[PDB]
Design a protein that fits this description.
Subcellular location (chain B): Membrane
Oligomer: part of a larger assembly
Strand order of the largest sheet of chain A: 2-3-4-7-6-5
Helix content of chain B: 25-40%
Structural class of chain B: alpha+beta
Shape of chain A: flat
Shape of chain B: elongated
InterPro entries (chain B): Bact_OuterMem_StrucFunc (IPR050330), MotY_N (IPR041544), OmpA-like (IPR006665), OMPA-like_CS (IPR006690), OmpA-like_sf (IPR036737)
Protein name (chain B): Component of sodium-driven polar flagellar motor
Order of helices and strands of chain B: EEEEEEEEHEEHHEHEHEHE
Pfam families (chain B): MotY_N, OmpA
Distance between the termini of chain B: 45 Å
Strand content of chain B: 25-35%
Radius of gyration of chain A: 28 Å
Disulfide bonds (chain B): 24-146
Largest sheet of chain A: 6 strands, antiparallel, barrel
Distance between the termini of chain A: 27 Å
Number of strands of chain B: 14
Strand order of the largest sheet of chain B: 1-10-9-6-7
Number of strands of chain A: 17
Chain lengths: 287, 270, 287, 287
């Protein structure tokens, strides 16, 4: 696995932008909500049409939506990012709509992008635009600062952190990378920003073997799927479910489930009994 | 600015070109400049040659400065002045002795050995040539292993050999068999050896015809052995001189044993 | 991939223009909204016909619309750009309409284009005009300033940025291009504007290989499609879904889905369990 | 069993983050609860739209939810974690929704993550997001402090604690690890944080045999499954259930159950009689 596949550079982050806007050009599948009409009236005032107070627009092709964009790291003004458009009123469908000018604000309350474009919906009330938002401002980055760069593991593990440190040391030389915890690995990097990009290009393509990790059993209590990871061991026991008795991975337990009618989701309750009896060498996680 | 010849981390590669018990050759291609070759050879003494081989030959003899420059990705570390060499005209740069081992050591620490000099082909301007340490460790381990598995004798040490026979029998002594095994190892690993001269001859104890018969039987046994190593029959030469041409005083027990001997002389095509 | 295919020049941007207008000539598929009638009355006053106050026009062939145009970089007065016309009232169809004179305003509130023309609609409430807007004003550009030009990658990556820098250096010479982050590459350029255009013409056609990028799994939660990118690796595990057990890309998991009835969209929930168990070497992205 | 499979490092803990948010883009399966409307109005005020007091939004595509995330140990800012989204009002379904910006608070009342993204629901009122929460703050750790590290057994046992101590001592040397109770094992570790990570990497992969543990019988009173562990012994007795008599693991008792009609869950009551008569060498646990 390449380092870039299983890790991210510290300080090189994404940012989330959110804004309110109106979607027009709907085939009569718009809203009549008070906030939609209020926003529509304000927008019309912005163009020189001001209705008398208390006038009902009777609009049916306009829907109020919430626009969200994720700003990739090193985003420069003039670039385009995707936006997700979701209806917040009572519009039946956003299919075929057009997002009007909406300003996308950061967590500090400043506008960083402007979103327009045509919605592509499949849920008819959520659509996407491939280049809806144009980046208008930059977010500063700590990437070029300091005397080292840091890799953050996507899956935290002490062994994976140490193996990535060894991979860099073998490639470059001794005392070059060090694991500071189960997630972060610090690599000494050049001070020049151009040399650091060239340096990081060679390092992020290094190959190493991530560790297997702790043995876990993942149970989706609402879907019924049971994922048993590697290194999970079930201690032998006599399991009596329904009217039949079986002796002890899931293959034997699934057969015991199939013996009686019961249900494939009855296996989720057999594991909990095994966990209580100490017959599982691992972690039973319910998601 | 200046011309710096170094392999970027994406370009740096080290290779073990010759890996035999007679030679070791670790090669680092310096892009746009040439090669850096470390060579060790089977010998009784510690030997390493470093050759900076250039595509465009050295224009003039120049004083060269060897420094141990830290790589860019090592801020806060200073450069160590290693030494001052001389690169000669129309010859590859050569560093030998302890300095070549020191270059290997500075590469082991993760540093860049840098040769700086004024290039004749470059309007007599100062240029730098650096050896990258990227992808050096594994090939340095392989190089150290091959150096470990080097013969402890050279062609000069075995080219002339004199072996002795036992008092009774057609077999060589223990030490003579050990030396013959050394010769066989060197021959089997060296393809440049062309000629083998064998001159068996014995003591005066037996009759002249008997001496000649013993000497010729011994010569033929040695010729068959040398054939077993893979040399073609047109290369081996064997002659039995019997009890003639004594090198020691026949009559003394030690002298007769001295004369009961074979001469083996190798000849190479380097 | 050419540089112009995978990158954009910094400072060479598009601008978005928006305006309000009326669409006439509709076969009785117009509006009766108060703002449509108000705008219609103002337009008629602009031609010398002023109805007495409180007069209802009873118009049925006029619809109020929002007009949007994108101004390409280096747009000069006299050029024509496309406009998207979307209905904002309650008109049933804009098919066969004609957009009347509408002024398109920039983000600074100034008029930069005027839009007219004939609508081409397929959604019957959104139409397009191929040369609707005529550019009337220029937007200044920083392209000719400075001693360098900058390329912004469409897909940000450290390796792609460095490879594009090497491509320029190999073509021209040493110390010519430098990657300053994962997105931008700076190339030294001539000071003369004519020479910079000639210089940029040769550079933008250079070929190089963009990097593969980080391994990702993209899941469209509303369509059901799962796109597994290159370099994604799934660690072996025992997955029990429904009543059958399978052992471990998607091909094996799709067969496990097909074993039981379930649904092709049940695979989206199997991946989440694998992500929780650490059996995915990559990023699971939900769009 | 590896040490990392059956133990956890003391001081290396997870943290739970909880927050309130709204889910939009629902196909008319939203709420009308007073708190949903109040939160929606406050959110709209945050964007510049303030409805007059007493105005009913009449929203149908918005649902109020509770967002929960678990913060893994050594979580750094910029990383992404899963979030579970559960409806707390009266929404019929959260399928196809989009979670709006919600702040996730720790047990001390501070915000440590921000959650957005697209919901993936199978129960239609609970959904998951694979990278919903972005970590914004760090929680300090006692991992690098002291002169030792401590392993906490997932299944507490004196013999397992001592065997893990012997495993470390055999690998490293005498007087290196010591069991302080049935759960914890203390291993002397380097003072340098980088060396401690390298040290812990070698130690957590050590193999040893966990002890069998106390003999137990686990009975799920609501599912009917009976899990009899190893080392459980039933003393011989004459059991008369229904009308037939049997003599004495579960196999004989299951046959006695099958003799009469009765039910497979009647075995749970036979064990309680055996427990009262002292015919069980173990613990009868009801879960």
């Amino acid at each position: 696995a390449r380092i870039k596949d299983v890790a991210q550079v510290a300080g090189v982050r994404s940012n989330q932008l959110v804004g309110y806007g109106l979607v027009s050009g709907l085939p009569g599948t718009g809203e009549a909500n008070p906030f939609t009409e209020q926003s529509f009236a304000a927008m019309l005032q912005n163009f020189g049409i001001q209705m008398p107070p208390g006038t009902k627009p009777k609009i049916k092709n306009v829907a109020a939506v919430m626009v969200t964009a994720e700003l990739p790291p090193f985003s420069k003004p003039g670039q385009q990012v995707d936006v997700t458009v979701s209806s917040i009123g009572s519009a039946k469908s956003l299919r075929g709509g057009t997002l009007l000018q909406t300003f996308l604000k950061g967590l500090d309350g400043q506008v960083y992008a402007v979103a327009q474009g045509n919605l592509v919906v499949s849920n008819p009330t959520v659509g996407l635009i491939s280049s809806g938002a144009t980046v208008e401002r930059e977010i500063p980055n700590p990437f070029g600062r300091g005397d080292y760069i840091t890799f953050n593991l996507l899956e935290s593990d002490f062994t994976t952190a140490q193996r990535m440190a060894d991979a860099v040391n073998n490639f470059l030389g001794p005392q070059m990378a060090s694991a500071v915890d189960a997630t972060s690995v610090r690599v000494r990097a050049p001070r020049d920003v151009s040399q650091r990009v060239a340096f990081l290009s060679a390092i992020e393509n290094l190959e190493f073997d991530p560790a297997d990790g702790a043995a876990k059993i993942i149970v989706n209590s609402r879907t019924g799927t049971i994922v048993v990871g590697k290194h999970v061991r079930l201690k032998p026991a006599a399991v009596t479910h329904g009217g039949m008795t079986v002796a002890i991975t899931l293959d034997d337990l699934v057969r015991a489930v199939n013996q009686v009618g019961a249900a494939p989701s009855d296996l989720m309750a057999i594991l909990q009994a095994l966990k209580q009896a100490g017959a599982i060498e691992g972690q039973l996680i319910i998601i | 600015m200046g011309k710096r010849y170094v392999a970027t981390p994406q370009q740096s590669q080290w290779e073990m070109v010759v890996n035999t018990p007679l030679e070791c050759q670790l090669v680092h291609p310096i892009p746009s400049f040439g090669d850096a070759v470390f060579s060790s050879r089977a010998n009784k003494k510690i030997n390493l040659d470093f050759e900076l081989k250039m595509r465009r030959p050295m224009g003039e003899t120049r004083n060269v400065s060897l420094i141990s420059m830290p790589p860019p990705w090592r801020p806060g570390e200073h450069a160590d002045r290693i030494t001052n060499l001389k690169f000669f005209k129309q010859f590859d740069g050569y560093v030998g002795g302890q300095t070549a081992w020191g270059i290997l050591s500075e590469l082991e620490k993760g540093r860049y050995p840098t040769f700086s000099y004024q290039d004749w082909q470059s309007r007599d301007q100062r240029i730098e040539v650096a050896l990258s340490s990227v992808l050096f460790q594994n090939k340095y381990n392989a190089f150290s292993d091959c150096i470990s598995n080097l013969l402890k004798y050279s062609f000069e040490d075995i080219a002339f050999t004199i072996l002795h026979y036992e008092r009774q029998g057609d077999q060589l002594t223990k030490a003579s068999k050990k030396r013959l095994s050394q010769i066989a190892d060197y021959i089997r690993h060296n393809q440049d050896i062309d000629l083998v001269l064998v001159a068996t001859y014995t003591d005066s104890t037996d009759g002249k015809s008997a001496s000649q018969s013993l000497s010729e039987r011994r010569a033929e046994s040695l010729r068959d052995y040398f054939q077993s190593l893979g040399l073609p029959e047109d290369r081996i030469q064997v002659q039995g001189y019997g009890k003639r041409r004594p090198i020691a005083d026949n009559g003394s027990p030690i002298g007769k044993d001295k004369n009961r001997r074979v001469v083996i002389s190798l000849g190479r095509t380097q």
